[PDB]
Amino acid sequence: FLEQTDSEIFELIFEEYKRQNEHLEMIASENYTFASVMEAMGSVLTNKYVVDKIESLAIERAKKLFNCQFANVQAHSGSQANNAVYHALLKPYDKILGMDLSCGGHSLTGKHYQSFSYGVNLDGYIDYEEALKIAQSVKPEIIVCGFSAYPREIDFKKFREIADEVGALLLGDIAHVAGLVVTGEHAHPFPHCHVVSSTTHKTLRGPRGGIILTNDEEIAAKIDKAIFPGTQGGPLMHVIAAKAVGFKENLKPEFKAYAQLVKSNMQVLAKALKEKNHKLVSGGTSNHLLLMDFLDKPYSGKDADIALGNAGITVNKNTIPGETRSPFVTSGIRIGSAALSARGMGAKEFEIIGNKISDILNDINNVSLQLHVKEELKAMVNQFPVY
Amino acid sequence: YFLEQTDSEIFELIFEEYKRQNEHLEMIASENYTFASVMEAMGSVLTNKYAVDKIESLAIERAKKLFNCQFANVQAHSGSQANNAVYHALLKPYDKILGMDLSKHYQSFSYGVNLDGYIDYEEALKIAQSVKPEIIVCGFSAYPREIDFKKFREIADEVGALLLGDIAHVAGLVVTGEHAHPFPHCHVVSSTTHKTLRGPRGGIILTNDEEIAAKIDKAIFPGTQGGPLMHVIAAKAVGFKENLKPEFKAYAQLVKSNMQVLAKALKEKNHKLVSGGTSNHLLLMDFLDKPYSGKDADIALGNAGITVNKNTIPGETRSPFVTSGIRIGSAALSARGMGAKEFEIIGNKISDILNDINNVSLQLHVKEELKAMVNQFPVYHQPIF
């Protein structure tokens, strides 16, 4: 009935749905939401405004899915989740240790905290020994593990060893691998982490929001008061019901297959890139993503992002360890598997995808090549429709 | 519907809420039934779109034509976050705010209500001369009459304050011409997109000053909160376009039309209303000199199908969690199409239960009679879109 009342909005929705169908989304953060989730998102629950039956069911499935004791499913974003943990567990000017991708470069500012950083190996792996050294120097009130551009598994255990020695808290931000964590395709953060924050979209393919989890009753109580309003007299029930719908789909064993599909596709893509002698940070991936490395190549990370978009492949420029160039051109790119794997695309496609990528960056200024593969890939993605 | 197959527990709760919206009479002033098309955009593939946009631009333009202003910001997630975004864009810390009550670093002061139940503009002037606020705020959740923006500008312009009209509770009436218009008297206007507007839940900030409009955009830049939610902004544009139709002006007259019928009916059964009536979508009963409480009245009719809330009234005797008044709104039942015939019946059923407030048998009896009335006024035909 949008086709009858609002023509202009309807053309914009169809424009978008055709736009999602006719390109390869390989940005690591992007995915296609469960159809069932959009259904709840567009229900009469937007009308309704002391526990509600629906946030219970969301918290119930949240606890079962993430294997924990308490859950706050009211965070509006992955950033609020992290920020809400900070207000609940810290005091002003408390120190915060977190990850970046520098190598050895490590008092910096926060919203009203002090941020310190630990980095990675010369092998692109997290340097845990260096982290304990920094943790012993800084003596931080909290440590954050988790990172958007990290191509490998995080060792939540070794981090709790560093936090126990230093007398710190351990926040697990699994917002980028929650799909892999939830299905056993990634080290679980519990019981090593005092708190876990995460986004409910991305790899979990739920609605857009945050979630907070913990096994400690006192932390759960403070998280409830820190989230406090959402600044609204109404808890948005349709979004919460959408959250519970997304959690039940994540518990299905079909989702566990999706998760290993996401990782094996990444394995195919990474293998296909190296066989043509491209360089990946840490030499590969154990993740939903890889990071190409262009430090010793004529073109930039900016250059490859633009070129590959011209071919209809949406990727992500990203700085890498040992960054030579400016932060707004960078020396790498960050490619994701989770979007195509939700389409049902398997190993055969991601290998063709892998060489079509290799062909374009081995010839970064061949505009006609980029255009040939764009049409060649639009016909593939047309064979694997979303919805 | 996938949800019936894939998740019957959630669908059970969705169909339960939809069945309930047609099982009781909804009379909370702030509650209403969003347009069926708005919910259709809420569940679009626009969720997957992580990112100004053609859709954001179309929402802003419809906002300017619906609210008759030169600028609009659609990125607020609630009427409250829209107010706070205005304060944080225009006020340094320790600045002063003067807003209405029912008798960050910012300091709040209040104006109030005279004995008649109307805003007292003479006192509101005297408090603004003394406090010297940097912003005066109109708009109030439980006021039964029209806000005189033109006079609030005179108070603001006399003391050099900004005027913020908060038309969130009266927005459907303003953009229809059934309420005084906040422009161009108010320097800046805030509102919700639900309640009387019948759109999705969220906020809107309006202004005819460009340098104010630029500060707001930067205050929404930090409070963006990981968006923008393209399905929600697309929903807001859908509601604005239904609000421009002449069907909406017909509706907003019904909301006042029905509220006059009900207010008239309560008075001829010798019930006291705050300010003696309404110019509005809403009405407040006065139980000051009465043996029962606003909580007692709420619980009473709640168990009779009529969903109202308890409310403070000027010169309150009882606690805050017990009150001396109830607030009765008219918009949600008007969206169902109920008219003067139904709203007349409502008033007398309210008296019968208000004058025998502890007859639980009368309450369950009244609930069965008016649920057959509500059976003949469906709100939607579908639970999901």
Author numbering:
A (entry chain A): 4 to 52, 67 to 123, 131 to 411
B (entry chain B): 3 to 53, 68 to 119, 135 to 416
The authors write:
Its physiologically relevant reaction is the reversible interconversion of serine and tetrahydrofolate (THF) to glycine and 5,10-methylene tetrahydrofolate (MTHF). As MTHF is a major source of cellular one-carbon units, SHMT is a pivotal metabolic enzyme for the biosynthesis of purines and thymidylate.
In order to obtain structural and functional insight into the H. pylori enzyme and address the weak PLP binding observed in purified HpSHMT, we solved the crystal structure of H. pylori SHMT at a resolution of 2.8 Å. HpSHMT crystallized as dimer, like the other known bacterial SHMTs, and no evidence was found for higher oligomeric states in the crystal packing. The HpSHMT structure displays the typical highly conserved overall fold of type I PLP-dependent proteins and is formed by one large and one small domain. Despite sequence conservation of these seven loops, no PLP was present in the HpSHMT structure, providing one of the very few apoprotein structures of an SHMT enzyme. The two active sites of HpSHMT are separated by a distance of 24 Å (calculated between the two PLP α-phosphates), which is considerably longer than the average distance of 18 Å observed in most SHMT structures. Remarkably, loop 1 is completely disordered in the two chains of HpSHMT. As a more detailed view of the active site indicates a very strong structural conservation of the residues involved, we propose that the structure of HpSHMT represents an inactive conformation of the enzyme prior to PLP binding.
